[PDB]
Amino acid sequence: GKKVITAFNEGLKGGGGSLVGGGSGGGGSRPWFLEYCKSECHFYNGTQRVRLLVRYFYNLEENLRFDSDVGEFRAVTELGRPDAENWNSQPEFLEQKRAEVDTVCRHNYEIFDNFLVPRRVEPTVTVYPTKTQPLEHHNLLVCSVSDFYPGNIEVRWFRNGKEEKTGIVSTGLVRNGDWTFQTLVMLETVPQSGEVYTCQVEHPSLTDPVTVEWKA
Amino acid sequence: GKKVITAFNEGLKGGGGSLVGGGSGGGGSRPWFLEYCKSECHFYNGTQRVRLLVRYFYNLEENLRFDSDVGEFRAVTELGRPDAENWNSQPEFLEQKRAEVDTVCRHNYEIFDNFLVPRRVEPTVTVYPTKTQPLEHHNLLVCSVSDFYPGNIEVRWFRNGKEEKTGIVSTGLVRNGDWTFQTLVMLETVPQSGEVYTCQVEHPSLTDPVTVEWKA
Amino acid sequence: GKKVITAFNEGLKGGGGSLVGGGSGGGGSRPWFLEYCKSECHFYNGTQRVRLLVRYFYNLEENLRFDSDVGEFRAVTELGRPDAENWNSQPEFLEQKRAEVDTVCRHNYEIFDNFLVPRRVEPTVTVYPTKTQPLEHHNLLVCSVSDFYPGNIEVRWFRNGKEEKTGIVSTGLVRNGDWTFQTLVMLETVPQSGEVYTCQVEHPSLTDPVTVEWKA
Amino acid sequence: GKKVITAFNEGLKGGGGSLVGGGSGGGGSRPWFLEYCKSECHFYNGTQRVRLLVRYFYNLEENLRFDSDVGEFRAVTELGRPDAENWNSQPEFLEQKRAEVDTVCRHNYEIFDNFLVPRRVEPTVTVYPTKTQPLEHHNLLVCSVSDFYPGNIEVRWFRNGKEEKTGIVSTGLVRNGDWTFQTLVMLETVPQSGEVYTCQVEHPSLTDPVTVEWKA
Amino acid sequence: IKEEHTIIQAQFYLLPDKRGEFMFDFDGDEIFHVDIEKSETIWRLEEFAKFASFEAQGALANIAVNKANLDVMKERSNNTPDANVAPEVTVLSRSPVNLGEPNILICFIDKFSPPVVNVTWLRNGRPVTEGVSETVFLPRDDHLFRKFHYLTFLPSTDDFYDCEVDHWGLEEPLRKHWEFEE
Amino acid sequence: IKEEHTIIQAQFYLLPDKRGEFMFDFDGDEIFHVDIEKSETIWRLEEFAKFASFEAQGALANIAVNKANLDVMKERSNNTPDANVAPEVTVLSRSPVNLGEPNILICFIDKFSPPVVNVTWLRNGRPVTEGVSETVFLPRDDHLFRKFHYLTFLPSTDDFYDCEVDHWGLEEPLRKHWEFEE
Amino acid sequence: IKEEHTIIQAQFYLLPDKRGEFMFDFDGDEIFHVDIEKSETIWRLEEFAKFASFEAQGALANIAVNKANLDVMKERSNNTPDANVAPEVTVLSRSPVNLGEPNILICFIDKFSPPVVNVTWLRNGRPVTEGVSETVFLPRDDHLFRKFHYLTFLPSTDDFYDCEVDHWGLEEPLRKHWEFEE
Amino acid sequence: IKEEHTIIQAQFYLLPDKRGEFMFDFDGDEIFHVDIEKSETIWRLEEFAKFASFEAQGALANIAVNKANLDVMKERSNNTPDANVAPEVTVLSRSPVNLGEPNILICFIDKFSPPVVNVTWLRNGRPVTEGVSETVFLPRDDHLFRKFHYLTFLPSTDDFYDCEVDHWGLEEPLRKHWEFEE
Ligand SMILES: *[C@@H]1O[C@H](CO)[C@@H](O[C@@H]2O[C@H](CO)[C@@H](O)[C@H](O)[C@H]2NC(C)=O)[C@H](O)[C@H]1NC(C)=O
Ligand SMILES: *[C@@H]1O[C@H](CO)[C@@H](O[C@@H]2O[C@H](CO)[C@@H](O)[C@H](O)[C@H]2NC(C)=O)[C@H](O)[C@H]1NC(C)=O
Ligand SMILES: *[C@@H]1O[C@H](CO)[C@@H](O[C@@H]2O[C@H](CO)[C@@H](O)[C@H](O)[C@H]2NC(C)=O)[C@H](O)[C@H]1NC(C)=O
Ligand SMILES: *[C@@H]1O[C@H](CO)[C@@H](O[C@@H]2O[C@H](CO)[C@@H](O)[C@H](O)[C@H]2NC(C)=O)[C@H](O)[C@H]1NC(C)=O
Ligand SMILES: *[C@@H]1O[C@H](CO)[C@@H](O)[C@H](O)[C@H]1NC(C)=O
Ligand SMILES: *[C@@H]1O[C@H](CO)[C@@H](O)[C@H](O)[C@H]1NC(C)=O
Ligand SMILES: *[C@@H]1O[C@H](CO)[C@@H](O)[C@H](O)[C@H]1NC(C)=O
């Protein structure tokens, strides 16, 4: 169903707590001023345990936050002290904030659990050698895993049946920004005309492990 | 034993999860390698509620953490992945880590509750004006509060008995590194011969509010 | 119940005391560096009297030790002098070391006193002659005692009721590595068709002596 | 009256406990047989605590010993088992051996305590640089301390009043075999024209430290 | 058994550019954002709109609050400014490159603030405005931003590419090269 | 209202310097640190020793663990280094300054890494070694470090001071100036 | 008579092999050892587990200490090495040998250092990798090590066996032969 | 500096050489020894004699026991022999050398067994039998022996010396060199 996504409500800041400033890079650098806020919902076992963390930043510094496990706003730096004292004295606003863990976090999670949590995209797996430089060091066997979601993936290396443990290098999980990941897992060995290598890939979008052999 | 401070026990890292590294790219900048760990005991209303947060940094990035409210290690970046899988598969180790909340946090807290938590050092308040014989804009009345502890302090200005709530600037709470704080709460006004100003400072180390009077 | 074996805590070594060094065994042999440490708890009648002797070895030489009956560290060679001086000047550390005789030795002794100290396995006694070739000519009668624990065992040979105290040879008490021992106690005699030989083995795992008989 | 030094009395070994040996080792190497015994008296704070440790060797291995803390003989290898059982069943003999801690160790100690224990010989300190060659203007600074007794000597390096702790290399304590010692302690520095170095030598024969100054 | 996830609502207002953005994030990926200019909810992936909705006016109302709060913050810190933090730039292919097979080049801009950058894609040294797309300013764990720019391209040993990024924190524009490698 | 506090154990090992530190922090202040060299517990305030103790070897032990782990991390990242982060330097009086009345100058070194720095106090352009002191590398809320240096001085209209801080992240040593201004 | 016993904790760290071990010993027998690579407490006899426990991480910490101390020892001796000490080798049966009755071949490697050795079992001149097991480097009364290698086997006048040991102190691999004898 | 000392009585009988020795050691140095063929107590230092006495017959009686015990040990081990362990040799001066000032050359022979050696002093390449002296076989902490040979000389820039030691465990005689330098 098409359920409405709700947003966290932001509070208005008042006056007071003026500071002389600090003194950072500048002079020639162009001035800029940023009011940035992130409200993060942390889930554990779905909605079993949820923690809400709101973080306020002004330019380069986080100055205030709302940890739903604390129940009250708390200044990270002087600059945020005014808001903490102010919003903490508005019982109505606090009650509202305290409930967002359910009216916002748990609420939106439920909606996203219908398509985002269950989203799964099968990886495209390939295998091939590289580094045509038998003068630089050793020979490298690359196992390419691309275009998959979610990010949690496991790629092992097998040489003639028995798995390899050392000599493994990777570029790690690379995020593409479009809900797909990619990664290259290499094996540092010395390919022989009479050798069989395999790359095993375990991923939640695969009923059972995908394998790809390679022989010289 | 309850007079001996206990240290968090650090686990040993193993092989696996090797990465291409990449980095940032200095070229001329001298190379350095830092293994940095911080174990934070967060206390809410004494030992009533405690949260243990361990954070691992390699050079400039945090790559792994252990949140006592989560109960297991969680990688923050690829680099921390091998350690989470390795340490999370060690039930004996996880059991010991989970209990450090008591064997270390609460334990050490109770020791510090005898001389740190109660520590109190009364502030020295002084009042004076600035910008005379060298400046043209607006005089300023400075209320200097130095050498106090803990950090939370309240300073208010008064003109002829009536409090001021604007034209107030501060250098904010300044930590001196030796367990004392210092600060300057300035009032922006033009002193007139027939005026009496009052700086009122409230601090937990003071039975009742302190007040310094100033006249021109 | 939750019996946890405790380990001896090793101290960290400092700088200073450096030496020139000389022709030990380098040259064509592969260089190697070994930091080896053995902490021995010697027990006399259980926990009545206990002696702790920790020995430090660098490569092939013992350079430092800690004898509980002495109370402090003592260099065995120049190379261990720095550590002797550094560690003995650390009252906190010394005290901890001096107590390990109780916190470690006696502690672990009580844990092991339940399954190791009383461990008993009964020997398998066998008797047979060696060296034949053709028509047969034996000059050695072998009493084989195997798979037993502890090692203290007693073997005797008897000929027609009368014992033998000459011509006895043995391979000695041989440790198999898996908590069992074996041994061959041989008797030099020329077996005559009308003779009776007997092997009597005494062992703490036997309520009464075991005897095997052998006639030609 | 001239004190007479008493010797430890050695026991006679009996038969039994014969062993096969181990086969063959070198072969081309000349055969030899050594019966070696060392009776060591260990003193702690003079005769306050004395420990007798007799050790028996046959060729290259210790096989038996008598620790006065144990009160009886103990085999170290099977080759000594026969002796242990033999001497340990002779009450008169054990009594005697146990008494040698008094009739031999303490007795002789009181005799050597008149000239050996208090023996003192003043070191002869000298300072000088090294490493000239073709291209070299500054290197090591050798502090030579020779002809002294006993061995516990402490050498310290000073640079213009302040003391050096890094760059110190030494030959350690060298025993001449004639009841005197010697040692070279060198400082790794760069001797400038305007520079004052000094070597401080502490030793039990010197009422007060001895120093030798050196300038470029 | 381990269903751990993170949802983030990230919003900002920036001066003097008068720019503002609002977005939701799921495990590090963007679900949608709101054009403070068009007042229209824009889904990162088209398909998402069939499973949910969001009233864009909420985002706009929220930005307005950030805009008011910004003025208060500028006063509370006496208009003191912080230095500009320059971005790290990496160019890579969306998936294994094969000659003659349609692909996508990725220009990943990371760890920078303020959230304003100029990006130019260059194919054979010439600017390209066809087949290009971009994400809005995404959140990182800290106080900085990250962003993706995309280019549809047809692999060939004949061409080469460059992503040119300009940020107030750079002395001069940053150019990252990319070309096919067998 | 509520007794909220934070206790922090901070430790590290640094290469190629081969430097290590272990320390405890109470609400932002140092309780004590261990001299990896002198194997000694050093309290920030002498008076803390009367209320507790802490075994130094156990700390040297923890450091040893960080040393071993550092090697693994070097292997795991293929010795790939990060850029040095230069420090912000501030020089202020510890308390109100009155002529002829002995005070203390504070050299606050913040937001830098690695935890290594050369600090030179300067009086009238001349290096000063008498009456100077310092803390160990202290923790911040992030991955960077902070540190304090102190200089006891006699308030005068004559002399002027400079705190010179050199760090691998700085092109040229940084020098903050300070003089009296009635 | 007299309950006399010895308990020993033996640990080492070796370079340039980068090998370490931690083990406990009771009267000359291994109680357990900790696999520096598997971070697991391994009991010599399975049955010992039901009578006690040992936290593996504790042992890894001790090893780390030995690792740091090793570096110090090298600096202290100016990286001066010693001569390798070749081992004596002996092959014998675990118990009396009887055709058709299962048994175990024991390969006793004694008096050697450093604690690194390559052991190869051979059945009828051919490498055997099945039914082979081994202990860790156990302690002797002195500074040298001993080790046991095991090979399950079925006694037959048809087969012969061989334990080949290689060590840096041996010019050529040392091989010992064994075969059934009536 | 607790009065810690060691006193050792060391004795042996060696075959087939039929050599026997008995000595006393204090903290590593010989007090005296008895010549088994001469039945005389020889003091390491002449002066020692006025402070103590020792009946040589007590040592000869002890050697006699070692002599009988040796045969028993030979039988007990079926006359199995162990390898010969070669010595380590070092040549040095007793004290700092100065041209024209009487001095002494020390030939330190260490870690060897059996206890028999042939030491030859060489000046300019020719044997030297005048002004030479030696110690008997001194004990070490282990099972091996040590010994010192001595040569009185007059330092000169023209001469060079060599201490040639031959032991059954040496393939060829071992020759250490020594010449002036200062
Ligand atoms: C990014 O490009 C924009 C152009 O859209 C630059 O902003 C313009 O700058 C000029 C001169 O500085 C002004 O006259 C325009 O009014 C600006 N336009 C806008 C929309 O801001 C901007 O300078 C570039 N950014 C950087 C870092 O160079
Ligand atoms: C900071 O001071 C240290 C010490 O003076 C400098 O590092 C030393 O530099 C010399 C020569 O460059 C080396 O021989 C030493 O080994 C270095 N370390 C030490 C501990 O002395 C360092 O270059 C200075 N500069 C910075 C930015 O730290
Ligand atoms: C024992 O076996 C090991 C394993 O093959 C040998 O060590 C390797 O030797 C090769 C070739 O010299 C090196 O490339 C490896 O780096 C070594 N290490 C390992 C873990 O394999 C060793 O040389 C063999 N010989 C001895 C005497 O141990
Ligand atoms: C060391 O010197 C001894 C004796 O000078 C040599 O042994 C002698 O060898 C001859 C014949 O080879 C025998 O007749 C003697 O009985 C031996 N001993 C003695 C005391 O005369 C020995 O060969 C020399 N070399 C070595 C390595 O010991
Ligand atoms: C605020 O900033 C201005 C410069 O824009 C400066 O002149 C003034 O001193 C600052 N105010 C305070 C209280 O520091
Ligand atoms: C590791 O760093 C070296 C440079 O020292 C580099 O040549 C090599 O390619 C790097 N390894 C990987 C997998 O990137
Ligand atoms: C914890 O807080 C509650 C109220 O929040 C208070 O009543 C209680 O006394 C506190 N506990 C302690 C030990 O102070």
Ligand SMILES: *[C@@H]1O[C@H](CO)[C@@H](O)[C@H](O)[C@H]1NC(C)=O
């Ligand atoms: C998640 O659920 C599991 C049981 O399924 C539990 O063991 C774990 O502690 C839970 N995590 C949190 C953060 O509650």
Ligand SMILES: *[C@@H]1O[C@H](CO)[C@@H](O)[C@H](O)[C@H]1NC(C)=O
């Ligand atoms: C230390 O060892 C090196 C071998 O790398 C040698 O060149 C040097 O002379 C030695 N120096 C000392 C003081 O032992």
Ligand SMILES: *[C@@H]1O[C@H](CO)[C@@H](O)[C@H](O)[C@H]1NC(C)=O
């Ligand atoms: C004893 O040694 C001899 C050689 O001297 C050998 O032939 C014999 O087999 C050995 N006897 C025993 C019982 O080991």
Ligand SMILES: *[C@@H]1O[C@H](CO)[C@@H](O)[C@H](O)[C@H]1NC(C)=O
């Ligand atoms: C030597 O005497 C002191 C004080 O009399 C004592 O503490 C020490 O233990 C004694 N030495 C020994 C080895 O007991």
Ligand SMILES: *[C@H]1O[C@H](CO)[C@@H](O)[C@H](O)[C@H]1NC(C)=O
């Ligand atoms: C050990 O045996 C002795 C017999 O001398 C006895 O006195 C003692 O109580 C026993 N100790 C233990 C711990 O069993």
